[PDB]
Every structure is written in structure tokens, then in C-alpha cells.
Amino acid sequence: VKELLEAGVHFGHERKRWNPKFARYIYAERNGIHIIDLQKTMEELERTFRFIEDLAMRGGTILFVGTKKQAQDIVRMEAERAGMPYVNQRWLGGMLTNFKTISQRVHRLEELEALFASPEIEERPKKEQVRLKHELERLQKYLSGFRLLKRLPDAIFVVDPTKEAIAVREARKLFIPVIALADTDSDPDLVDYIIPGNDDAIRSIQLILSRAVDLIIQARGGVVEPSPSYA
RNA sequence: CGUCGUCAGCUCGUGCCGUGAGGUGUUGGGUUAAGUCCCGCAACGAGCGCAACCCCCGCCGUUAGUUGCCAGCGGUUCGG
Ligand SMILES: [Mg+2]
Ligand SMILES: [Mg+2]
Ligand SMILES: [Mg+2]
Ligand SMILES: [Mg+2]
Ligand SMILES: [Mg+2]
Ligand SMILES: [Mg+2]
Ligand SMILES: [Mg+2]
Ligand SMILES: [Mg+2]
Ligand SMILES: [Mg+2]
Ligand SMILES: [Mg+2]
Ligand SMILES: [Mg+2]
């Protein structure tokens, strides 16, 4: 499932703005930039995917987090495709560590879908319609990929662990294992199942997250053919 | 009951940070009469306050016509 010229796709990036624990995943540094050893990326993609597989084939949830503008859209696609939750927009504080309270907000979200499907009163004032609807779009913006989470994920997949340090933090306090793609600006030891690759180029964000979702469906019940990628 | 003070404020739940007192939220940019609302945010909500719901005055309509009103008719002791 794994493919090999991801070299055409990413080979990583970032100049000495690096974290030095990431030393082991580096072949050399080129155009004043850290160049990620793909042979290591391989060793890892395997061991990571093995974990991913077992989790799919036991029907266990993955939380997908990415909000850096680059990996932003491709998590709505790729996660819906896996029929799994994600946070696309802002990563609210305490989503895992204070789950039940955050979710108490999704009941509100549902409750608006129900109320605003119609009618059960449109004899409520004009302002209130406006007010309530504005709220509705709101929850929808952050909470959309979140509602699929009815229980604490059995794992979480993150695009930038540095950028999503809070996320990795919340998981570790819960023992929720962490999967992440991570370029050279990252603390490796902080990840359980790790994908040492460029995390800023959508070429790469694409390949890795897709093949992830692919392995997710392929072992879950079915197989599928190409999914959406912006050029 | 006064007062600060009709001032925009004071807290809480759980989360997070801190050995701890405590912090966060309630800070921050814009806006408002206002913790008023907007956006941003390790917070996410909730409460007592703000506001709204009640009374008065301003415009209009309807229900009413006496003890109140008199526009036109008729009388009119000259006082609807
Ligand atoms: Mg980065
Ligand atoms: Mg607290
Ligand atoms: Mg201290
Ligand atoms: Mg503590
Ligand atoms: Mg406290
Ligand atoms: Mg205060
Ligand atoms: Mg305070
Ligand atoms: Mg302010
Ligand atoms: Mg005031
Ligand atoms: Mg308020
Ligand atoms: Mg705030």
C-alpha cells in the first residue's frame, strides 16, 4: 500500500529551525535546509500503518487534527472519507481532557439541527431567528468533524505535532496513542507512531493522509479508488 | 432601609497552569449605556448583575357615549 517515490512528493524541509531530537531521521542538509532520510520514513510508515490497520480491523476510532492552512482542507476530505472525526478549524482547549463538557456543546449543535429543520415555533422573534442561526453556523464551523466523536478516540492522527502540541498533550494525559506526520521542527519522542515527513507541502500532506485513509477503508470493510486532491 | 452605585461588575462547574496562595475563563483588538456585542484565545459553558418582560408620556386604531364631548339640523327662557 506504501509507495516509494514520495521523493517526488516531499522528502521534507526546514532549515536549522529544527529540533535536535529529530536528528535520527535526517540524512543530510541541502539548500540550507534539513533533508529527511526517506529510507527511515519507510521503516516508520510500515510500523505506523501496522498500528493503524489493527485499529481499523477492530473498529476503533481515530481523531484527525490539522489546522495549519495547508493540511486544513485535506482533513475534511480525508477524514469524512474514513467516516471518522476531525478538527479542521480551531483546536478547542480541553477536547479530550475535558471531553464531556465540550460534547455538551454538540448536544446544543444537534439541538439546533432539530429545532432549525423547522418548525416547533417560527413564532419566536425575528432577532432570535437571526441569533440562533448565527450560533448554528458557528458550532458548525468548529464542531463539524468533532460530533462523529461520541467517545474518546482510541487514537489520534496529527499533521503538525509542534503546531498541535496541545493536542498531543491532551492525548498523552489520557494514554490515547498519537500518530503524526512531522517535519524536522518536531519533538519525535513525543509521538507514538510517527511519520517523519514534510508537514507543510500539500503534496505530502496529501499522500500521507490519503494512504492512511485508504488503509483505513481497505481493512475496515471495502476497498476504494482515487479520492479528491487539489492540484 | 442607606451607601459605594444603575457603577459593570461578582462568581461557579469542569478543563488547563502553578509545590502553593492563585492564575486561566473575566486578558487581549473593535464596539457598546453596560462582562453590550463582534473577532481572537487553553479553554468550554453556566449563574447572579446588564438588557428585555411591568407602569407613565408621545402617534395611530378598535371597544365603548354618561355625569363627559358639540361638528351640522331644529329649536335656544339667551345656560350644549
Ligand atoms: Mg511546521
Ligand atoms: Mg477553575
Ligand atoms: Mg510560580
Ligand atoms: Mg496540579
Ligand atoms: Mg480557581
Ligand atoms: Mg473580574
Ligand atoms: Mg480573575
Ligand atoms: Mg477588551
Ligand atoms: Mg449602565
Ligand atoms: Mg453578558
Ligand atoms: Mg474570551
Q: Which nucleotide minimizes the distance between its C1' and the CA of A169?
A: B16
Give the residue from A57, A62, A72 showing the smallest Cα distance to A156: A62
Specify the long-range contacts of residues A110-116, CB closer than 8 Å, at least 24 apart.
A110/A147, A112/A136, A112/A139
| Rounded distance between C-alpha atoms, residue A84 and residue A210, angstroms | 13
Q: A195, A204 in Cβ contact below 8 A?
A: no
Burial readout A113-140 (b: 16 or more C-beta within 10 A, e: otherwise) = eeeeeeeeeeeeeeeeeeeeeeebeebe
How many helices (H) and strands (E) in chain A?
Answer: 6, 7
Q: What is the dihedral of CA A58, A175, A84, A52, to 10 degrees?
A: -50
Q: Which nucleotide minimizes the distance between its C1' and the CA of A90?
A: B41
Query: In the 8-state DSSP scheme, what is residue A150?
Result: S
Backbone angles phi, psi at A53, to 5 degrees: -45, -60
Window 100-159 of chain A: CB closer than 7 A to strand B: 101-102, 104-105, 134, 138
> How many residues are listed for chain A in this entry?
231
Radius of gyration over every alpha carbon of chain A, rounded to an integer in angstroms: 19
DSSP string, A4-60: STTTTTT-----S---GGGGTTEEEE-SSSEEE-HHHHHHHHHHHHHHHHHHHTTT-
CA of A139 to the centre of ligand 6 (A): 27
Backbone angles phi, psi at A11, to 5 degrees: 35, 20
Tell which strand B nucleotides have any atom below 7 Å from a protein Cβ. Answer: 13-17, 38-45
Q: Distance between alpha carbon A42 and the CA centroid of its chain, in Å?
A: 20
| Rounded distance between C-alpha atoms, residue A136 and residue A19, angstroms | 41
Q: A213, A79 in Cβ contact below 8 A?
A: yes
Amino acid at A140: Q
Amino acid at A103: S
CA of A59 to the centre of ligand 6 (A): 47
- The reported resolution of this PDB entry, expressed in Å, is 2.9
Q: A203, A10 in Cβ contact below 8 A?
A: yes
